[PDB]
Structures are given as C-alpha cells and as structure tokens.
Design a protein around this nucleic acid. Structure first.
Ligand SMILES: [Mg+2]
Ligand SMILES: [Mg+2]
Ligand SMILES: [Mg+2]
Ligand SMILES: [Mg+2]
Ligand SMILES: [Mg+2]
Ligand SMILES: [Mg+2]
Ligand SMILES: [Mg+2]
Ligand SMILES: [Mg+2]
Ligand SMILES: [Mg+2]
Ligand SMILES: [Mg+2]
Ligand SMILES: [Mg+2]
Ligand SMILES: [Mg+2]
Ligand SMILES: [Mg+2]
Ligand SMILES: [Mg+2]
Ligand SMILES: [Mg+2]
Ligand SMILES: [Mg+2]
Ligand SMILES: [Mg+2]
Ligand SMILES: [Mg+2]
Ligand SMILES: [Mg+2]
Ligand SMILES: [Mg+2]
Ligand SMILES: [Mg+2]
Ligand SMILES: [Mg+2]
Ligand SMILES: [Mg+2]
Lengths: 187, 52, 52, 52, 147, 124
RNA sequence: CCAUCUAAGGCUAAAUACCGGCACGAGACCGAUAGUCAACAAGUACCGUAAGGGAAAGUUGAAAAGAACUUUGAAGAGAGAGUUCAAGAGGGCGUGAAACCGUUAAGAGGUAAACGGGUGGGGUCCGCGCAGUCCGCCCGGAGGAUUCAACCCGGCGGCG
RNA sequence: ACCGCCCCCCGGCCGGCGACCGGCCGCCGCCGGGCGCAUUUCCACCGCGGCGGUGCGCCGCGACCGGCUCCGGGACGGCU
RNA sequence: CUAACACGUGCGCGAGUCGGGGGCUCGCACGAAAGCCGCCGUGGCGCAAUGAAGGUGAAGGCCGGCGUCGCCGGCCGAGGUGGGAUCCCGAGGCCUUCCAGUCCGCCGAGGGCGCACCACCGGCCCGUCUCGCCCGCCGCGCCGG
RNA sequence: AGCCGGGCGUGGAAUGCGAGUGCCUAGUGGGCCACUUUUGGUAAGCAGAACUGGCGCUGCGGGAUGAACCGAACGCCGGGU
RNA sequence: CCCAUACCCGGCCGUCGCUGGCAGUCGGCAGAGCGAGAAAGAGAGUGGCGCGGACGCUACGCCGCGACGAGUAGGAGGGCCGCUGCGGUGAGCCUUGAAGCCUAGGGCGCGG
C-alpha cells in the first residue's frame, strides 16, 4: 500500500500525428531522428508542431509573415511555419522572402515567386539547416477561430461578453428579458 | 426505412486528387506487382501502343 | 522528383516502335492512399439501391 | 497532360485545375539521412546497452 | 459505421451506460423546451438571456430586396480591378486615374476601413461613408454617385 | 522513391500473409520471406534474390540492374551456379561484397543458398 | 396626387403526382420462428349470431430403382432376401443438436447435490516412444572423381 | 498595338540522369569453353578422436560461485 | 434511422468555398454509376457591426509652411508595458614536442529581435447621456457635418 | 498617480513536489455507521446537526458468527518477517 | 513461537514515466568508441601474405531503465475475439470429400 493518487498519472500529449497520410509521416520520421540526434530544440519544437491537429496549426497570412519578418534584426532569415501560408489580398508590396511551410496557397506561392523569394518544404529545410540556424519560427493566430467567441464565462451573467448560440440574428432573438433594464433585468 | 442516407457526395477537387494519385501509382512497378498483377515480362509498365 | 523521362510507344507486334512520348506530369503526382481510399469508400455507395 | 495539366500549365480541358502540390519533394529518406551536410551536425550515437 | 460506435462496446453491461439508480426513462424533464420559465429557468437565464419578452416594432410585409445593400471596404477596393490596371496607373505619368465601379462588381456602399495606396482613383458607387470619402480625398481621387 | 512505396505497401500487399501472430512476405526476390523494409524485393533499386534452379540441382542468383527501373522485362539478371557448396557460397559472397551491391544482405543470401543446397541433396 | 389591373361568363396540352391495375427490369435486402398473414389445396382450415378474428404446414433419392420372394404372427409389427454410392436416405424419409429417456462399460455412494485450491489413485487415448539429438571446423585411416589455383577466349554486371 | 502566362526553334549558362542514359576507357566480380593434371580441389565412409554451439528418452545425485535470508560458535574493544 | 445543433478529430481548397438543383455526355451489363459545365455560383455560409427604427458604419504617428499656426505640403506608417518557446550576437572557452600562426566546428557571461498566448493601458466603429464651439451650401432651414 | 532611464542577485524560514490553462462530458442529486461535540425525546438498532474516517464501490488476517470494529487495502508466484 | 493478498528480496504479466536509445549495417574505397564527476573538437592544416567479419530495422519496429497495478454507477483505449453481406486480394481450399454436428484425443491464448 502506497499513499498516492493515479488521476494525473498519464499525460495526454500526442506521441504521433493522428493523420494517416504518408508524406507527413515521412516528415515525422526525419524530424524524429533530427530531434533525438541533435541538441537543438528547434527540431523538437518543429516535430511537436508536426504532431499537432489542424485546429492547432492555424493558417498564417502573407501580411502577418511580412509584418513579423520586417522587424529589426531578422533580415535574410528563413521564415518557418508548420501551417498553411494563405494569401492576403489587402497588401500590395510584398518583399522577397525565404519561406518554409507544409503547404502554400497557389496565389500566395505565385505572389512570393513573382516578388522573387523562394518556397521551401520541410525536407529541403533539413538539408539547408539541420539544426535550423537563421530561422524565424512563426505561427498563425490560434485564437482566430470563431468558436472561441462562445467560450469562457457564460452569457446572461455580469461582465461576460460571450456570444450566445442563436439560430438567427434579429430583434426577436434573445433581446428582451436578460438584455434590457426595461424588461426584467440587465446583466 | 427507405429514406436512409444511401448516397454520399465528395468534393470535385478530392475526386480529381484521387484520380491523379491512382494514375501516378499505376506507373510504379512495385505497387502494380503488389496489387497482384503479373507484369514481370512487360517491357515497360507505362505501356503505350499506337492508335492502330 | 521533377524529372519527366521519355516513354517509348510499343507496336502491336510487341517490339519498340520509333516513336516516343515524354512522360505526362500526372504520373509525378503525390500518392495518397488515404484520399484514394476515402474517395472510393464514399463513392462506392452511390450505386446502391435502397432496401427496407 | 491536357486533361490534368502540367506543374506550370493549367489543365486546358478543365475550367481551372492544376496538379496537387507536393508536401515533400525529396522523399528519399535514405539520402536525407546519408547526406554530409546533415551528418555533420549530429552528436555521436550512443549504442552501448546498460542493463540493470 | 455501427462498428465504431459506443453500443458495440456496451454489450453485456446491464444498464447500457445509463445508470441503475436513475434509469433511462422516456421524458423525465418534459418534451422539447418545456419548463423554460419554471424548472429550466436557471439554464435559460444562464445561457440564453433575453429569450422571453417582446421588443421593437412589427413590420408586416418585409421585403429584403428593398434593404439589399452589400458593402465593400477600401482595403478590398483595389481588388475589384485587375492588377495590370493598378500597376499601369502607378507607373503612368500623365496623372490619369483609373475608374473603379463597385456596382458593376456587385457592391452598393463603400465603407472606409483599410489603408489606401497612394495613387488617384475614381471610385463610383451608390452610397459612401464619411471616412471613406475623406480617405479617398486624402489619397487624391474622386467620389462619384450613381443610381 | 523507395520509402514512399514502402509506406504504401507495408500493410496492403497481395504478398502479405498474416496469421498465428505472424507476418510473412511472398514476392520472389525476398530473402527470409518476411515483411521488412530491408528485405522487401520490389521496393529497392538494388535487390538480391536466391532461388532453386529450374533443373533439380543448382542455385539461381538474381541481381537487379541499375538502368531499367521502370522496365520489368529487362530489370533482373540471372546467373546459375552449379558447383560444390563451398565454392557456391564463395561466389555469392564475392558477388555481394566486392560489387558493393546491397551489402546488408550478404549473410542472408549465404544462409538461403546453403539451405537451397541442402534441400537439393538426396534425403537419407 | 400617383402606380397597376378590369371582378361578378367559358375552354386550354407540357413540365407535376401515383403503396390500386397490366407487363417488365433490378438489389451491398430476408432466407421457412426470417421475408407479405400467406414459398405448401391461405384470407384456406378453424372461432364468433354478427361486425370481425385467422393459423400450422418446404427438403427421400441422380433415377422409384418405393423393398419381388421365404418365414412367425389375426394383424400392427419383425427376421432373412433385394435396390442404391448410401436404407448410417424406407413414403412427415437431407443434415439430425440440446433438454429428456433406455441399455452397455467404468467408477463411486450415511451430512442433498454441485463448486474453488492442492495432490494422490485408476482409466481411454497419444508420443506412431523404448538404447536417445544434430550442426559446423579440424586430426587420423580407408576410398572415388576429369579436380584446384594461375592464364586465354567470349558474354554479362557493378563502380569510376 | 501593349502586358502576363504557356508550347515550339536556336543560342549561353546552372543542376540532375539514384522516381530519368548510350558509346569509349580503366578497375573489379560472375558465368560458359579450353588451358591446367593431382603434396591442389571436391564427394562419401570409419574413429566410441578433438574444439565450439544446442540439447540430454525418462528418473536422479554431487561440487563450487553469486544473491537473499534464519541461526550457531569464537575472539577484541569503549563508556563503565 | 432521419433532421437540427454543439464540440473534438481526418482530408481538399483557402478570403473564399460548395453543384446538392439543372444541363451536356451515342441513355442503359456493371451504369440509377462516373466525367464535364465556369457567362449554369442563381444561391447558401463566410468576408461588418450596431440600433426598436429612421440610419450610421471600424487607426493614426513625426518635420517644413503664421507654438499667442488659421491652414497647405514633406513625410512615416496600423499602437504601448510586462511575461514569453524558438532564433541573432557574443566577453570569455573547447589540449598534448615545443614555438609562430591559421582554418573549421562545438561552449558560453551578458545582450538583442521577439511567434502564439495571457494580463493590463491606450485607440477606432454603432446606440445613449453631459458640455461646448466651429464648419458647408443648388435650395442658409425645426438643414447637414 | 502614471510614465521613462539607471543601480543593486547572499533568489532573503523549514520540509516536500513539475506547473499552468482550455474545451466537451457521463453518472449522481433516497444514504448509513463510528470516537469526539451536540438538539428533541424517559428512552430506542428513534428523529436532527458539526468535524474526521469509513461502508456504500472492498476483497484479505483477527473479533466463533457479522455491510461499519482492530490490523491492513489487492496483478500471478517462491523465500523471509 | 504461529500467520494476511501488509513489509523486505527474487521471477513473470501489464500500465505509466524517462515526450529514454537505435537510420552507425559509417568494412582492403574499412578501421569497429562516444558510461565518462566536471558546458564544450579521438578537429583540419601553415611557419621557427591469407579477400575475411553473427543477429538487426514489420521505425505503426526493436531495445534499456525506474515506479506502480482495488473497484459499483460511469468514461476511454486495444482486440491476429466473434456473426452476416459488399469491393479488392490469396495462380486460396474442396466429391482423393465443403458446410454443419459429435468426441475419455494433441495443443495455443490471461481472456473473448
Ligand atoms: Mg501494490
Ligand atoms: Mg485521468
Ligand atoms: Mg461498468
Ligand atoms: Mg436521470
Ligand atoms: Mg432520452
Ligand atoms: Mg372579364
Ligand atoms: Mg376569367
Ligand atoms: Mg377549367
Ligand atoms: Mg440496371
Ligand atoms: Mg430450418
Ligand atoms: Mg426436415
Ligand atoms: Mg450418406
Ligand atoms: Mg433424417
Ligand atoms: Mg456399474
Ligand atoms: Mg432518485
Ligand atoms: Mg440518525
Ligand atoms: Mg473509494
Ligand atoms: Mg475496506
Ligand atoms: Mg463474539
Ligand atoms: Mg508469503
Ligand atoms: Mg519487488
Ligand atoms: Mg484496476
Ligand atoms: Mg461431452
């Protein structure tokens, strides 16, 4: 008999991608080897992010990437994102960038290639920089999904700006009792 | 009941992707042989003959 | 790889004719058994008659 | 290749279609390990068993 | 598929994952949205405030087509025309400004949100906003109304 | 490539047989007849096979050539060796080693050859 | 002030619907307690004054070749004989389970029986057991081969 | 007319031909035929021969080594 | 089992996405499938919110021109603080006859640029309240900003 | 009070230990018992509370027997205590 | 002195943790290491005969160390557990005997 608790004995993190495609699994093999036979933690972070799910790999926009690479000090370094690089149409001037991503939108790829940059895939990234020196690791906005507007402190409760679940927006849908001081109460 | 959901719809891009993948895999001797087809005598598995 | 070799056209006699055609780009498409299986599964359900 | 288009040419017979992009180009894992520029940046392989 | 569902793993457990004390009876709380004000009041108030009551005026024969008015923003404003148009206007030296008609592309009102690149534009629309107008004037350009 | 088709075929081959908590591979040029990346005879560019001769005695050694990867008809070269066991094993060993031709299969090929040879010897 | 029609008379195909009817085609359906109630002399037998209610029930064999003839018995029913690849298919006859029963063999028996753990004893069968494994590399002895290495010719392959 | 993209021809580079080669030369290996002719090479048999590996048909015993335990017999010393 | 909704997961495309309805494919073993439409994206969902409604509808920061600037240009551009995986730099430091002297790679004080995300402070849009002044004109008004 | 910039690391009690955070969510909403405290009742294997631990959901050694007591909580085995 | 499923030592199964190790099978074209108290190079350079060497690695694999293992209601995972039909595949099986049924026979798996 030992006075211990087994509730949190097992950790929940992912050991391998839930996906079944073969290209991602080959990438996982390569980066598993790199992470376990290299002291650099960039490989560990990249492999962990390869394991993650789709909603945990949000797309990164061209405007975000250029904005985060225009910061001082990080010139002529390769921007690495484990998600999808999507094009942003509300930006005219695009510089030359050295991008690496699993997949890139067709229009975004056309824009970068026209601007003069080059697109890399995580394989060739391994060949170029195994330990990943000169890399700027970016990611898309994880809280960008609209489901996060429904989360948190419940609506109809003071100081809670949480979106309710309504089938249609209008004046006849959840506007009368809990939303007005004129009818009952106002939270 | 007869109104079970018998049919399914797939995206056109996904259908085209599947077709492309099948076509590309049909050109590899290892995969064709592993499918069971006897092609050890075939001169070239992307087999092309004239229009005659 | 991006290399597109040259594929010979075989005559009906079984021997190689003088003609040859470059390999179409489709055969270099990625192989995804995941997508192939998903599209098959879901499409081989659209030729199914109801029962009840 | 007119049906499915090349890597740099869209499909002429379809409205707007192009071959799916490769997630990884060089899928020769044996090379990707056995190349000098990656082997240089590696620690020594510990391969001696330490039993209880 | 029935293969992967919880029922297959539940065979042999008398209870079927619904408890022994409180069984799986027909409708313990009433059908549908019953008791919204009586015994589900806490849930209704906590998760759907404003559900009960009336507010606003009644409009009988509503026609959405009268109020149809799609909008566009200035950051998207240059995407209505082709890129070659914009680059030609950019490297043009005569000072001529391209004309962008949002009604042709299916927008009625122009709202000014994004930053506008510094080149003259002749934006013709049906409705404008004050900030969009001042953005166009500041960048140099013209605002034209159509019916 | 090679790893790609290995990932394709590791579980969906016609040569795969799985029973009695076992798994075996069937395609011809596969020493040890087991499902593995090393010994799979259809994936790699350089492949070694050892088969019994068509005649009741001898051993056929099959080597995959380097040029015609997509031409199955002219992709394998076969050599028949019909001698004593020691010289047969020596010839196979020289062929595997001194050619630098897939050296990881040297002992497997030698073991398979020795076996075929014994089988060929009349029973007691 | 504008806008738009001309009521209180009439006709009109096509696109649309179809668990009845005639004639067809098909199925990731059921396979005789299932599928229609009904695979069969089924809305039949049968029940109720009536409205109405409403079953059970498929399979010898390739071919009846369906057991001539003798014998005991009043007969049912048997013993021989015969057909058949098979009567270990004999007219509700393919296969033929369990519950339950008869008989034969073995074992046991005064705390109802049965059960878990641990042994012991006796059995039916199995090892096709009953002088005990094989495998290299040597050493020694008795043998026998068209015999090794090195060269020449030709072919093939790998690498540069 | 202009611009973008793509196909084809020619010219010049870069890279690959290990998802995609031909000729020449060199090295190596293999195979077929002669050369080779038995202190070489090979095949089969015998020894209760040796070394190494795996096991004994069944039933048993002993020895030493190590781990963990229970106990016994000696002797020495300190505060005392 | 069908429909709806929510969330988590896998795949395709991605500021877009989706032919489900229809049509073209010599209708018809499979095939009642599959392919195609692109000037068949009508349309749905998303890309803008807020107000009961009339309606309105999403940054700005520096210098020269009249600080006690009216007001035109030159610009620069979508905040700030704290914490932040990674990356950059790098004082110093990693051996052997000695000695001069390198190359390449690893270590590392401190110092940078700081992803996502959290907290906080500002800013902008719509309704509403308080205060107060100014500006525009085809119609100078119970006008508009 | 808010802002900037600068300087101070002997990380300022002991002991122990990775921590934070977000979604979706079943069952439950009849309880009972014991030391101590305690209300009603003559009292009760009665009725009602507070703290902690149990039983319920739990087998094992002991109390001959036993939901709650004493010891002790459990994978299949050998030895020792 | 006696003994519990408690405690100590040992074996075995499984779970969890180390988000541990292994692509280095680098071989006459070679040189067999990264267990060792001390953050980092068996660093590169310039001047004073016999042809030979086990296993491996279904990387969804294999291997090594520790700790732990009660369970109703309930939740989750893995089933090379099982039943029926469909698309593939086994140059599968079968009148020299399939399905089904019976068995004091030989076995496997913790179990289905
Ligand atoms: Mg325990
Ligand atoms: Mg848990
Ligand atoms: Mg349960
Ligand atoms: Mg309930
Ligand atoms: Mg219910
Ligand atoms: Mg009229
Ligand atoms: Mg009329
Ligand atoms: Mg009429
Ligand atoms: Mg049909
Ligand atoms: Mg039956
Ligand atoms: Mg019958
Ligand atoms: Mg019979
Ligand atoms: Mg019968
Ligand atoms: Mg008896
Ligand atoms: Mg209850
Ligand atoms: Mg009480
Ligand atoms: Mg408990
Ligand atoms: Mg207990
Ligand atoms: Mg007592
Ligand atoms: Mg014990
Ligand atoms: Mg132990
Ligand atoms: Mg348990
Ligand atoms: Mg029995």
């Amino acid at each position: 008999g030992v006075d211990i608790r087994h509730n949190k004995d097992r950790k929940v993190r992912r050991k391998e991608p839930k996906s079944q495609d073969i290209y991602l699994r080959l990438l996982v093999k390569l980066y598993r080897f790199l992470a376990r036979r290299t002291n650099s933690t960039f490989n560990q972070v990249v492999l962990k992010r390869l394991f993650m799910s789709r909603t945990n790999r949000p797309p990164l926009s061209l405007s975000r990437m250029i904005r985060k690479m225009k910061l001082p000090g990080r010139e002529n370094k390769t921007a690495v994102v484990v998600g999808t690089v999507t094009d942003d149409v509300r930006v005219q001037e695009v510089p030359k960038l050295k991008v690496c991503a699993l997949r890139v939108t067709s229009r975004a790829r056309s824009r970068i290639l026209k601007a003069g940059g080059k697109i890399l895939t995580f394989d060739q990234l391994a060949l170029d920089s195994p330990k990943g020196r000169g890399t700027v690791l970016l990611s898309g906005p994880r809280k960008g999904r609209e489901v996060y507007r429904h989360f948190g402190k419940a609506p109809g409760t003071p100081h809670s700006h949480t979106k309710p679940y309504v089938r249609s927006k209008g004046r006849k849908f959840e506007r009368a009792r809990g939303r007005r001081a004129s009818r009952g109460y106002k939270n | 009941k007869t109104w079970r959901r018998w049919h399914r719809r797939v995206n056109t891009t996904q259908k085209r992707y599947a077709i492309c993948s099948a076509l590309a895999a049909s050109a590899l001797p290892a995969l064709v042989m592993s499918k069971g087809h006897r092609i050890e005598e075939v001169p070239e598995l992307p087999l092309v003959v004239e229009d005659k | 790889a991006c290399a597109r070799p040259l594929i010979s056209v075989y005559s009906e006699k079984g021997e190689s004719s003088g003609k040859n055609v470059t390999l179409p780009a489709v055969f270099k498409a990625p192989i995804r058994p995941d997508i192939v299986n998903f599209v098959h599964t879901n499409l081989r359900k659209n030729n199914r008659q109801p029962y009840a | 290749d007119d049906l499915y288009g090349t890597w740099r040419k869209a499909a002429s017979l379809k409205s707007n279609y192009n071959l799916p992009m490769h997630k990884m180009l060089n899928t020769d894992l044996s090379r990707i390990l056995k190349s000098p520029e990656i082997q240089r940046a590696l620690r020594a392989p510990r391969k001696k068993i330490h039993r209880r | 598929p029935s293969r992967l569902r919880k029922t297959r793993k539940l065979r042999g457990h008398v209870s079927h994952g619904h408890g022994r004390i409180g069984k799986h009876r027909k409708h313990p709380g009433g059908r549908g949205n019953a008791g919204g004000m009586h015994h589900h009041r806490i849930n209704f108030d906590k998760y759907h405030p404003g559900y009960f009551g009336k507010v606003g005026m009644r409009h009988y024969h509503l026609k959405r087509n009268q109020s149809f008015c799609p909008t566009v923003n200035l950051d998207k404003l240059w995407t209505l025309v082709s890129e070659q148009t914009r680059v030609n206007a950019a490297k043009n030296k005569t000072g001529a400004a391209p004309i962008i008609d949002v009604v042709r592309s299916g927008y009625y009102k122009v709202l000014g949100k994004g930053k506008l690149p510094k080149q003259p534009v002749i934006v013709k629309a049906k409705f404008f906003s004050r900030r969009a107008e001042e953005k166009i004037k500041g960048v140099g350009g013209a605002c034209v109304l159509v019916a | 490539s090679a790893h790609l088709q290995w990932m394709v075929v590791r579980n969906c081959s016609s040569f795969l047989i799985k029973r009695n908590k076992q798994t075996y591979s069937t395609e011809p040029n596969n020493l040890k007849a087991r499902n593995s990346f090393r010994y799979n005879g259809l994936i790699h560019r350089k492949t070694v096979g050892v088969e019994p001769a068509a005649d009741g005695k001898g051993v056929v050694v099959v080597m995959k050539r380097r040029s015609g990867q997509r031409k199955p008809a002219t992709s394998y070269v076969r050599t028949t060796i019909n001698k004593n066991a020691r010289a047969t094993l020596s010839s196979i060993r020289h062929m595997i080693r001194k050619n630098k031709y897939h050296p990881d299969l040297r002992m497997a090929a030698i073991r398979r050859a020795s076996a075929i040879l014994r089988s060929q010897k009349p029973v007691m």
